[PDB]
Design an enzyme around this catalytic site. Structure first.
Site, PDB file in Angstrom:
ATOM      1  N   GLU A  35       0.821  -1.205   0.000  1.00 23.54           N
ATOM      2  CA  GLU A  35       0.000   0.000   0.000  1.00 23.54           C
ATOM      3  C   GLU A  35       0.859   1.261   0.000  1.00 23.54           C
ATOM      4  O   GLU A  35       0.564   2.216  -0.731  1.00 23.54           O
ATOM      5  CB  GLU A  35      -0.943  -0.016   1.206  1.00 23.54           C
ATOM      6  CG  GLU A  35      -2.065  -1.057   1.133  1.00 23.54           C
ATOM      7  CD  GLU A  35      -3.139  -0.737   0.090  1.00 23.54           C
ATOM      8  OE1 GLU A  35      -3.113   0.364  -0.505  1.00 23.54           O
ATOM      9  OE2 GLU A  35      -4.009  -1.604  -0.149  1.00 23.54           O
ATOM     10  N   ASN A  46      -7.756   9.211  -5.760  1.00 20.75           N
ATOM     11  CA  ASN A  46      -8.617   8.263  -6.460  1.00 20.75           C
ATOM     12  C   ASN A  46      -9.435   8.967  -7.539  1.00 20.75           C
ATOM     13  O   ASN A  46      -9.579  10.193  -7.549  1.00 20.75           O
ATOM     14  CB  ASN A  46      -9.569   7.561  -5.488  1.00 20.75           C
ATOM     15  CG  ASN A  46      -8.841   6.825  -4.382  1.00 20.75           C
ATOM     16  OD1 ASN A  46      -9.127   7.017  -3.203  1.00 20.75           O
ATOM     17  ND2 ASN A  46      -7.899   5.977  -4.759  1.00 20.75           N
ATOM     18  N   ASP A  48     -12.639   8.961  -7.973  1.00 20.48           N
ATOM     19  CA  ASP A  48     -13.861   9.575  -7.470  1.00 20.48           C
ATOM     20  C   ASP A  48     -13.606  10.856  -6.686  1.00 20.48           C
ATOM     21  O   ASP A  48     -14.560  11.431  -6.151  1.00 20.48           O
ATOM     22  CB  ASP A  48     -14.632   8.585  -6.590  1.00 20.48           C
ATOM     23  CG  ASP A  48     -13.893   8.230  -5.315  1.00 20.48           C
ATOM     24  OD1 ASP A  48     -12.797   8.775  -5.079  1.00 20.48           O
ATOM     25  OD2 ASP A  48     -14.418   7.409  -4.538  1.00 20.48           O
ATOM     26  N   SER A  50     -11.721  11.097  -3.909  1.00 23.25           N
ATOM     27  CA  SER A  50     -11.230  10.831  -2.569  1.00 23.25           C
ATOM     28  C   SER A  50      -9.719  10.602  -2.617  1.00 23.25           C
ATOM     29  O   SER A  50      -9.117  10.471  -3.686  1.00 23.25           O
ATOM     30  CB  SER A  50     -11.953   9.626  -1.962  1.00 23.25           C
ATOM     31  OG  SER A  50     -11.655   8.439  -2.671  1.00 23.25           O
ATOM     32  N   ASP A  52      -6.321   8.568  -0.480  1.00 23.25           N
ATOM     33  CA  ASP A  52      -5.840   7.562   0.463  1.00 23.25           C
ATOM     34  C   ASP A  52      -4.616   8.088   1.207  1.00 23.25           C
ATOM     35  O   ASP A  52      -3.745   8.716   0.605  1.00 23.25           O
ATOM     36  CB  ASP A  52      -5.463   6.274  -0.270  1.00 23.25           C
ATOM     37  CG  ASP A  52      -6.637   5.629  -0.980  1.00 23.25           C
ATOM     38  OD1 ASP A  52      -7.795   5.849  -0.576  1.00 23.25           O
ATOM     39  OD2 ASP A  52      -6.392   4.891  -1.952  1.00 23.25           O
ATOM     40  N   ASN A  59      -8.953   5.661   3.204  1.00 26.19           N
ATOM     41  CA  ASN A  59      -9.598   6.503   2.208  1.00 26.19           C
ATOM     42  C   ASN A  59     -10.502   7.547   2.856  1.00 26.19           C
ATOM     43  O   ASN A  59     -11.180   7.272   3.849  1.00 26.19           O
ATOM     44  CB  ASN A  59     -10.406   5.631   1.244  1.00 26.19           C
ATOM     45  CG  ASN A  59     -11.106   6.437   0.173  1.00 26.19           C
ATOM     46  OD1 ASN A  59     -12.290   6.745   0.290  1.00 26.19           O
ATOM     47  ND2 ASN A  59     -10.378   6.780  -0.884  1.00 26.19           N
ATOM     48  N   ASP A 101     -15.548  -4.262   9.926  1.00 22.29           N
ATOM     49  CA  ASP A 101     -16.802  -3.803   9.336  1.00 22.29           C
ATOM     50  C   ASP A 101     -17.518  -4.879   8.528  1.00 22.29           C
ATOM     51  O   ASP A 101     -18.597  -4.606   7.991  1.00 22.29           O
ATOM     52  CB  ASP A 101     -16.535  -2.585   8.444  1.00 22.29           C
ATOM     53  CG  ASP A 101     -17.674  -1.578   8.468  1.00 22.29           C
ATOM     54  OD1 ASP A 101     -18.359  -1.469   9.507  1.00 22.29           O
ATOM     55  OD2 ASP A 101     -17.876  -0.886   7.448  1.00 22.29           O
TER      56      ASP A 101
END
Ligand SMILES: [Cl-]
Ligand SMILES: [Cl-]
Ligand code: NA
Ligand code: NA
EC number: 3.2.1.17
Length: 129
Positions: A35, A46, A48, A50, A52, A59, A101
């Site tokens: 990562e 990203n 969209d 957003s 990271d 994110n 989650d």
């Protein structure tokens, strides 16, 4: 800060990630490698809109607030910049929420594609833990 392999393993172990939700330490070290290359200051934008952040590339659409991701949740209740610190506490505490989650470590695309199903124990081999 750019961590060494065993240095990061030791830090993650002290923060309670070894076997957290059943994921052995090597999984977390492997995910961090691919990562961020062990670099706490890593950021990536990203498609969209957003971004990271940090050693585990958390994110901004769901987990932290960076002031420029409209309609985002801040489910870890932290500014995204706190995830870039040389102190990994905030990244580890937020990762614990993420991995709990429902989808496990599949939330990290690089873990699914490059760590899952491999000999992740090799990532801690030779370390004094
Ligand atoms: Cl392991
Ligand atoms: Cl990937
Ligand atoms: Na090291
Ligand atoms: Na957000």
């Amino acid at each position: 800060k750019v961590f060494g392999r065993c240095e990061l393993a030791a830090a993650m172990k002290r923060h309670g990630l070894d076997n957290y939700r059943g994921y052995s330490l090597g999984n977390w070290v492997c995910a961090a490698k691919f990562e961020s290359n062990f670099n706490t200051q890593a950021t990536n934008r990203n498609t969209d809109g957003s971004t990271d952040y940090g050693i585990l590339q958390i994110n901004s659409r769901w987990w932290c607030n960076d002031g420029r991701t409209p309609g985002s949740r801040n489910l870890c209740n932290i500014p995204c910049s706190a995830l870039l610190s040389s102190d990994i506490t905030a990244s580890v505490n937020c990762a614990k929420k993420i991995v709990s989650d429902g989808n496990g470590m599949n939330a990290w695309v690089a873990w699914r594609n490059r760590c899952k199903g491999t000999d992740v124990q090799a990532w801690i081999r030779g370390c004094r833990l």
